[PDB]
């Protein structure tokens, strides 16, 4: 049963991506706090991690590249807002993909399951 950390500290958009990705049948963990979020990805292995570029504590970017230091976790970084260096600069520091919101669950659902694929 493929797990998922959703780190996210808006708590409608955290519930929704639970609610959707629970219905694919994946089982999903949340974290609200950056540094809950970071804590938790070093203790427990996930098959894919969401992070919000925009976290409290440490941002989802920093918390990208810490995780990828330690672990080849496929990880989704998703924000409301971002030009090209932020998109960048999330792939280079370990990223497997970057999406901007407005996204549609489909496309996210899809995304997910092409970086899964591999591993």
Same mark, same amino acid.
């Not at 949340?30 to 996930?46: F, I, P």
């Not at 497997?96 to 659902?109: Q, S």
């Given at each position: ?30 974290? $609200? !706090?950056?540094?809950? &979020? /970071? #804590?938790?990805?070093?203790?427990? *292995? ?8 925009? %976290? ?28 090209? $260096? !932020?998109?960048?600069? &999330? /792939? #280079?520091?370990?990223?497997?993909? *970057? ?8 496309? %996210? ?11």
């Amino acid at each position: 049963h493929t797990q998922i950390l959703i780190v996210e500290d808006e708590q409608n958009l955290a519930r929704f991506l639970e609610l959707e990705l629970t219905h694919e049948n994946y089982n999903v963990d949340t974290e $609200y !706090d950056g540094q809950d &979020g /970071l #804590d938790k990805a070093l203790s427990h *292995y996930y098959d894919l991690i969401i992070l919000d570029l925009m %976290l409290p504590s440490i941002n989802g970017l920093e918390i990208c590249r810490k995780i990828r230091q330690q672990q080849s976790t496929p990880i989704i970084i998703i924000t409301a807002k971002s030009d090209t $260096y !932020d998109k960048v600069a &999330g /792939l #280079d520091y370990g990223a497997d993909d *970057y999406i901007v919101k407005p996204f549609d669950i489909e496309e %996210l659902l899809a995304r997910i399951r092409a970086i899964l694929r591999r591993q």
